[PDB]
Amino acid sequence: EEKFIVKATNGPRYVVGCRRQLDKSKLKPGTRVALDMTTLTIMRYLPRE
Amino acid sequence: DLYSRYKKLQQELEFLEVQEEYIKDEQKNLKKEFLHAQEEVKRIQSIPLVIGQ
Amino acid sequence: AVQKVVVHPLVLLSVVDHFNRIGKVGNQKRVVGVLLGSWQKKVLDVSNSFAVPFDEDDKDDSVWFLDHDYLENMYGMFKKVNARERIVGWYHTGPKLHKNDIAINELMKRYCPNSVLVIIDVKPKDLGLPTEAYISVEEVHDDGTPTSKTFEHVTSEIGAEEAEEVGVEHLLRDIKDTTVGTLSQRITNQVHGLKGLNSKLLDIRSYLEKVATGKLPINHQIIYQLQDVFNLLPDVSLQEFVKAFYLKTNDQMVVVYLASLIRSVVALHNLINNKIANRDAEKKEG
Amino acid sequence: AVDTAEQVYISSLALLKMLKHGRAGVPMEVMGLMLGEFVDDYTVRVIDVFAMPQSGTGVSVEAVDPVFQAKMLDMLKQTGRPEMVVGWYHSHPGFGCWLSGVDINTQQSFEALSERAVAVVVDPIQSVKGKVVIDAFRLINANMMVLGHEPRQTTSNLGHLNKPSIQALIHGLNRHYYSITINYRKNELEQKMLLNLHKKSWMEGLTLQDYSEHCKHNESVVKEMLELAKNYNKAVEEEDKMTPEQLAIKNVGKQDPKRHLEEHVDVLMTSNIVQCLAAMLDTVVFK
Ligand SMILES: [Zn+2]
Numbered sequence: 001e002e003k004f005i006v007k008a009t010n011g012p013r014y015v016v017g018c019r020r021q022l023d024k025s026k027l028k029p030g031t032r033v034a035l036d037m038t039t040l041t042i043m044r045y046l047p048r049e
Numbered sequence: 050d051l052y053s054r055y056k057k058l059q060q061e062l063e064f065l066e067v068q069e070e071y072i073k074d075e076q077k078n079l080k081k082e083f084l085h086a087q088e089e090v091k092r093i094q095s096i097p098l099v100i101g102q
Numbered sequence: 103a104v105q106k107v108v109v110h111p112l113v114l115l116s117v118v119d120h121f122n123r124i125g126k127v128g129n130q131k132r133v134v135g136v137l138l139g140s141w142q143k144k145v146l147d148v149s150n151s152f153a154v155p156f157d158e159d160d161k162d163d164s165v166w167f168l169d170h171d172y173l174e175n176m177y178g179m180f181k182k183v184n185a186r187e188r189i190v191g192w193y194h195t196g197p198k199l200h201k202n203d204i205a206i207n208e209l210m211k212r213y214c215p216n217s218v219l220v221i222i223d224v225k226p227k228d229l230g231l232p233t234e235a236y237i238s239v240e241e242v243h244d245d246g247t248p249t250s251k252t253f254e255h256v257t258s259e260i261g262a263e264e265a266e267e268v269g270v271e272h273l274l275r276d277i278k279d280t281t282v283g284t285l286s287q288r289i290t291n292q293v294h295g296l297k298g299l300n301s302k303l304l305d306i307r308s309y310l311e312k313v314a315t316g317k318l319p320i321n322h323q324i325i326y327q328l329q330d331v332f333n334l335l336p337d338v339s340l341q342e343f344v345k346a347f348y349l350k351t352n353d354q355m356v357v358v359y360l361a362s363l364i365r366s367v368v369a370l371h372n373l374i375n376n377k378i379a380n381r382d383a384e385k386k387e388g
Numbered sequence: 389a390v391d392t393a394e395q396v397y398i399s400s401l402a403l404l405k406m407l408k409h410g411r412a413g414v415p416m417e418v419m420g421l422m423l424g425e426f427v428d429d430y431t432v433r434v435i436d437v438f439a440m441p442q443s444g445t446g447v448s449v450e451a452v453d454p455v456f457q458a459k460m461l462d463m464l465k466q467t468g469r470p471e472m473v474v475g476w477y478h479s480h481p482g483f484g485c486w487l488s489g490v491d492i493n494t495q496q497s498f499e500a501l502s503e504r505a506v507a508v509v510v511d512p513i514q515s516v517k518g519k520v521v522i523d524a525f526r527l528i529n530a531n532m533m534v535l536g537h538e539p540r541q542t543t544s545n546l547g548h549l550n551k552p553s554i555q556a557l558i559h560g561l562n563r564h565y566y567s568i569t570i571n572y573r574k575n576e577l578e579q580k581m582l583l584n585l586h587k588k589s590w591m592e593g594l595t596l597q598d599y600s601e602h603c604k605h606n607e608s609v610v611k612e613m614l615e616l617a618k619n620y621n622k623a624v625e626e627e628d629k630m631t632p633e634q635l636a637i638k639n640v641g642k643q644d645p646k647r648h649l650e651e652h653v654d655v656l657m658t659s660n661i662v663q664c665l666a667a668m669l670d671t672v673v674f675k
Contacts, residue, residue, distance in 0.1 A: 003096055005100075012099060013099070014099055015096065015098060015100065016096075017096055017097065039264070040097040081278070084283075088279060111585055111586070111589070114585060115401070115404065115582070118582075119401060122435075123468050125468075153467070172463070175463065183439055183441040184412075226577070230593075231588050257593065259589075260588060260589035261589060263411070264411070266404065266407055267517075268517050268519075269404055270586060272520045273403065273574070273582075274582065274583065277586050277590075280590070283657045283660075287660075287664045290595075291664055295671075298595070301594075349607060350606075350607065350666070350669065353607065353611070353662055354663065354666060357659050357663055360614075361659060364621070364653075364655065364656055367652065368653070371649070374635070378639070
């Protein structure tokens with residue numbers, strides 16, 4: 001629940017952790033998110049259109 | 050040499066006795082260094098990574 | 103406003119640099135530097151800082167020397183290279199709090215926003231936390247004394263972001279991590295008594311002295327609440343806590359069972375090998 | 389035509405500043421400077437180290453502003469930092485820590501003043517947090533190609549310079565290129581201060597705060613962890629019921645990599661917390 005698996009658009013797969021800012025509300029699967037080049041943290045998510 | 054064997058052996062007694070605190074130091078320190086290196090190679094492993102096959 | 107702040111070792115090591123570049127002056131008075139950080143977020147975070155020359159007078163304590171040009175230049179260039187950090191407040195290495203410090207902080211109270219004051223020691227003989235974060239605010243006094251700048255204690259923690267931990271750990275190669283076990287815990291369980299001992303001994307003596315033997319009404323009123331806290335525990339007879347002691351000792355019994363059983367499991371391979379290996383080695387020896 | 393053995397002295401100052409420069413070590417090319425004082429030929433000490441504002445041009449000899457340089461240096465002269473620049477440092481993220489054409493050219497241009505010109509390249513990006521160890525760089529002369537490469541004494545430190553054991557870049561780029569050893573310096577003040585500060589960093593303010601917390605959490609939190617511990621231990625024991633059969637069959641060789649011992653020992657180590665905090669609770673209750 002704390003750490004999940006992410007899928008990049010380019011096709012390689014990775015895994016990240018959980019930032020102390022965001023909560024487990026939007027952390028649920030089925031939602032496209034965003035990552036950082038350093039430490040692979042999460043600033044926010046990426047809502048589909 | 051018969052009575053001298055005692056006094057000559059006493060040196061070996063002290064020499065074998067002095068190794069006690071030594072092996073104490075070794076066994077107490079090298080385990081701390083063991084867990085040190087263990088956590089050193091443990092912290093190498095990180096959660097973020099790439100998944101292969 | 104700010105519940106807690108984060109102070110990185112880098113600034114205190116910059117104070118170590120202040121004690122470095124001295125070069126045997128023969129003055130070595132208090133030196134006021136300029137602390138930098140992020141006031142945007144609720145929690146304060148210290149990254150890096152710089153140093154400005156600060157001098158005072160022997161007799162007159164109202165003498166304080168700062169520089170506006172050097173400050174604007176250093177902060178200007180620092181903002182030029184890094185826009186993620188701005189000005190917050192200042193700090194001094196003086197063990198004692200001077201009366202002129204309100205006038206020294208008044209400048210940054212005017213030009214800049216509210217500044218936080220940090221007091222450290224010149225000689226690291228203090229076992230306790232060297233860094234004390236003091237916020238500058240104006241509070242209403244109950245006794246009716248005129249409104250003045252009051253320093254309130256703010257809790258703080260010493261930590262690093264990413265690489266600083268590695269740098270420190272590499273430069274030291276002495277200190278050990280948490281390392282749950284016997285020695286790491288028992289060391290704390292030993293020395294903590296002294297940690298409380300030296301502190302309390304250094305405190306309650308000067309306290310007892312200055313209360314009866316002294317003046318300048320620092321508002322002793324809070325110390326009645328101190329003594330009240332000391333009276334919050336009127337020697338409980340533990341009679342109600344007997345069941346709790348029973349549960350704790352029961353958990354102790356659980357620890358006993360677990361230890362005995364597990365060690366009994368470990369003894370298997372040893373008390374097998376000690377026989378089967380020795381007898382085979384002996385019979386195959388000759 | 390004389391050459392001695394040089395060793396670069398590195399303090400915690402430049403190290404930490406290069407760690408902040410490591411946070412500044414973004415793929416955008418950055419500039420840095422190092423200052424110090426030369427007591428003699430074969431020793432070099434660095435003290436004052438700062439960063440430089442980023443640019444779109446990247447690392448170049450044109451990127452460095454001479455008037456701004458001399459200005460900041462003068463501002464350091466009026467202050468308590470009377471040290472001349474001993475060289476310059478930078479970062480080379482992701483393409484390796486080696487030096488390109490422009491880099492060695494601006495190095496050639498910046499070494500016109502100082503014969504030493506210490507070159508330091510930090511790349512925390514692909515560098516694991518396990519080791520912060522860095523390797524300083526040097527520039528060999530182009531007229532020494534006829535004679536031997538490195539006429540340096542004290543060959544005992546080459547094993548300490550063997551830390552970059554990579555089988556590619558070293559003897560691959562070894563032509564007209566080499567490195568220099570790195571050592572540190574620490575006094576009693578820095579030692580005691582940093583040790584006390586770090587110990588306090590791993591400790592609490594009054595130090596009596598978060599202890600009793602866990603002491604009273606032993607009956608709530610730890611208990612569940614003890615239950616899970618018993619679950620895993622039982623999960624081992626069910627196999628331990630199968631073990632004496634194998635011990636009654638083979639006994640020759642070990643096909644099981646699982647030790648089954650040290651882990652349970654560690655479980656006991658976690659179980660000793662209750663015993664260790666018991667005396668703590670006793671001291672709290674007593675006085
Ligand atoms: Zn590049």
